[PDB]
Structure 1
Amino acid sequence: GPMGSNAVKVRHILCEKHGKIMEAMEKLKSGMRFNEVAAQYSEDKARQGGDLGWMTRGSMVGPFQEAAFALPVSGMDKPVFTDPPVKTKFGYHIIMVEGRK
């Protein structure tokens, strides 16, 4: 149905350990750009600055998906990200959204 066409262009920082995702969160809250935090801490897409690219509805693990579609589009100077981090079976994610349809 139509909702299957919904999509977000998503960027994340993924860490399996809570202590480490909290270190990443502290860096965001100090003003560090999201891609630079992802390079430092993310265990996925680190070499892409956390960028997952576009992901359609149904393609994301459940808690991630719900969190991502709840975020408005933002840019990395004016980010809007998940706080607190979102737990999935991959670990803890901090997510921002750069595009929406």
Structure 2
Amino acid sequence: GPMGSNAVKVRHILCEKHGKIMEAMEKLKSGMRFNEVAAQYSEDKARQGGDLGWMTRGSMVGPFQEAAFALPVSGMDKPVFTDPPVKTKFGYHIIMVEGRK
């Protein structure tokens, strides 16, 4: 149905280990731009600054999806990201959303 048309343009930092995602979180809280944190730490989409692009409802792993649709759109000078990190079967994610449908 209608909810299958919902989507987010989403960016993340993924780290298997909790200690490393915590290092990434500290960099965000120091003011580092999200894409630069993703380049330093992410194990997915690092060469894209963490950008996953547009993702439709159903296409994201469950805990990620719930966290992502809960975030308002933000930009990387004024980011709104998940805190605490979100655990999935891939590891720990810090997520921000740059577009919403």
TM-score, normalising length: structure 1: 1.00
* Count of residues paired in the alignment: 101
Alpha-carbon offset, residue 40 of structure 1: 0.1
The alignment's TM-score, normalised by the length of structure 2, stands at 1.00
- Match for residue 53 of structure 2? 53
Runs of 4+ displaced beyond 6 Å: none
Distance 1:4 1:82 in 2: 23
Indicate the RMSD between aligned Cα atoms, in angstroms: 0.1
Provide the secondary structure at the position in 2 that maps to 1:21.
helix
Q: Which runs of 5+ in 2 are unaligned?
A: none
Percent of aligned pairs sharing the same letter: 100
What is residue 14 of structure 1 aligned with on the other side?
14
Q: Per-residue deviation at 1:81?
A: 0.1
What's the CA shift for 1:30?
Answer: 0.1
Runs of 5+ unmatched residues, structure 1: none
Give, in angstroms, the shift of residue 16 of structure 1.
0.1
